[PDB]
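Honest question from a wet-lab person: if I give you the sequences of every part of a complex, can you actually get the arrangement of the whole thing, not just the pieces? Trying it with mine:
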Amino acid sequence: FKRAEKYVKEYREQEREKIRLARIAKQQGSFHIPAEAKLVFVIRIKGINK
Amino acid sequence: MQVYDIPPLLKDPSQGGDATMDFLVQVARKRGRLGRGGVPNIQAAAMTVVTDWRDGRIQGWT
Amino acid sequence: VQKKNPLRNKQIMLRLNPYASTFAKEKLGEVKAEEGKPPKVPASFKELLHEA
Amino acid sequence: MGRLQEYQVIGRHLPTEANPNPALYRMRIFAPNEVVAKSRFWYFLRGLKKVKKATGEIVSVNVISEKHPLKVKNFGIWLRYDSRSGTHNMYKEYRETSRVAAVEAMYADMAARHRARFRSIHILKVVELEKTEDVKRPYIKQLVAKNLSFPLPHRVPKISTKKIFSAKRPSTFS
Amino acid sequence: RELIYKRGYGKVNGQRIPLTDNAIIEENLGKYGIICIEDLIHEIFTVGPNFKQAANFLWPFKLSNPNGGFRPRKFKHFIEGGDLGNREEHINALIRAMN
Amino acid sequence: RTYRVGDIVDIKVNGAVQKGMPHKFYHGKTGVVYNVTKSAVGVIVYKRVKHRYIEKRINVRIEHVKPSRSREDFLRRVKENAELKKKAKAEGVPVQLKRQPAMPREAHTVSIADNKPVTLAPVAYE
RNA sequence: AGCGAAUGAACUUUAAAUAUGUAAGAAGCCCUUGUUACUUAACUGAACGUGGGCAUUCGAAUGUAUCGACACUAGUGGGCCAUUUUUGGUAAGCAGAACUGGCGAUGCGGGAUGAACCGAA
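Yes, you can. This is the full assembly:
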């Protein structure tokens, strides 16, 4: 229970942190380049022929 | 907790005895002191904590 | 004997994630954003969008 | 090509010790979404200069909303499409309320009259005609003509396709 | 969260066991400090030291056909109107359709 | 150049010498020496057939066999890892010994000032 | 790309795409010390013996329904089509190699219909 509380807090902190950094760069007249994604979901959708 | 993140421990039966083991596991997970198959290196985590305490990375007084 | 999706069986949601009850109770899914008057957009920024 | 969006995309070469702080190139791309916008951006950069996707990063992508969506206005678009013979330049005029709508009508007209595809059309420039008399095309200047008032003869009324049988014969005076 | 909750199956001794209990989660991933499905979700979402173990334990998700269907011709790249390739954040809507 | 029996050598096949030339499938390959003769060298090299591999034995001579430059990385890695582990154990600090796959880049900021972005056209006119 | 770097595909600081060879520890490394029937001016090499370190990141990622050996036991050892690359030739046909894929032992939806098409077993 307590650890899940902490995890939810961390998720919200990360989201508002990214938003805040973007706004700070916008106000300072620069562009903050988002960090590249580290996880991808891959779904095979084509059958194995040819 | 603030210094090493360390999400809340399971103190387990009694207090102070196996909480050290949980603390070492969490510190090894955070730092990156993992073993061969991912098992945390409790010895490495403990020695890192000892070195940090010696170097004054943690606060404390009597 | 019968797998139940927690999103439909909230009871399984309670079993697997004890934090769900307090999450729903305190409404963390619609948290208000922090207040404060937003700074205005730079005129240089606007000109950069409307450059060409 | 679909409900388009105008994207201001700024990209740059990856930083190097020999050459830090590149020139931060910019373009305007009409694409259905951001991924297509970035793909178009990298295509144009590799077609023009040596900078490629592997050696560059997109530092900014933004939407350029039309300034006055509620104003009908005149657009002139300079285009360079590629046909079987070769590259041919054209300048076409359109009447819409937004740049994205002008580009969509542009693509529709190009496909309809010259069989030009998205891969074959290069959008060189689009401009709002600031003042009248910059219209050169009759099919826009006729709408620009003063005091336009016309009827709509032979209006086929909308009868539901599921009403197979009609007791009275339709009239086409509405 | 939806993929782990709705279609969560773990590899337990080579057996596709549905992840219906935090006790099962702890028994399979206790050595890495993962003791709950929320811990597994955090590991996957914010990839950590034991993401290899977490992903290997997680059985390949068997997704259903998307509700509403694919695009008219799905066997092109995304940038050219198809469905193949890297769709970045639209994979979320794709998972909504399939799951 | 000199070659012992058992070392890794590359096959390049220069066009100057026509005597005992290996095949174009063998041009630019890598193998291990198993015979050394007066002028030619016996090499065991794998060749690919459908699903399996079959090791063929070919005689390629000194003008076109050259020593391989492959295992030097393995030797350098083992020496560097041994030395780095020595400093690690001596100084009581942990050092990362494996190779990482060059993870994706992190976030950063770039300043428009002194760097006004230049707008470009689909084709350059000038 | 540059040649506001030198020189001039045969120019190059750099460096593609693209497939294609070899290696990524504990059965592994290094050197030390000796013998030898071999070798070299000579532990110079080769093998045989010593020594050390590092087993809770033993030295990339992913995959893990296991792998290695010996012994024994049947049936098989035809080709056709196409992609790409490649060589030669004609007026046009075409002919020859290599890879991969499909049919050969394969049912099912679609192309009105079908050995060589699309999807999918």
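Two things worth pointing out. Residues 49-50, 52 of chain D lie near RNA strand G (CB under 10 Å from a C1'). The CA atoms of residues 11 and 59 of chain D lie 5 Å apart.
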